[PDB]
Amino acid sequence: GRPRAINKHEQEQISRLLEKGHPRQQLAIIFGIGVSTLYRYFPASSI
DNA sequence: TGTTTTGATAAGA
DNA sequence: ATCTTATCAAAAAC
């Protein structure tokens, strides 16, 4: 199958970043991934 | 040419 | 304008 966009290390990082209030929009641009991908890994209801 | 995850996208009592 | 969610066509890898 297709590889994941973010490995576990990046996941754990990105998690904290969002809990610190970083907009998914920016995070997506920086990590080179879709914005909707971010909502799937970390739902708004999960922060 | 054949069988997992990405990312646009539409809809949101 | 904005923000969120689940969907579904197809990229990505072998």
Domains with residue ranges and CATH for chain A: 1-47 (1.10.10.60)
CA distances from A29 to A4, A15, A23, A32 (A): 16, 16, 10, 5
Residue nearest to nucleotide B8 (CA to C1'): A36
- Which tokens is A25 given? 């929009």
- Residue A31 contacts residue A6 (beta carbons within 8 Å): yes
From the CB of residue A38, how many other CB atoms can be counted at a distance below 10 Å?
20
Experimental structure resolution, Å? 2.3
Please state whether strand C lies within 7 Å of residue A34 at its CB atom.
no
DSSP reduced 3-state for A25: helix
Please state whether strand C lies within 7 Å of residue A47 at its CB atom.
no
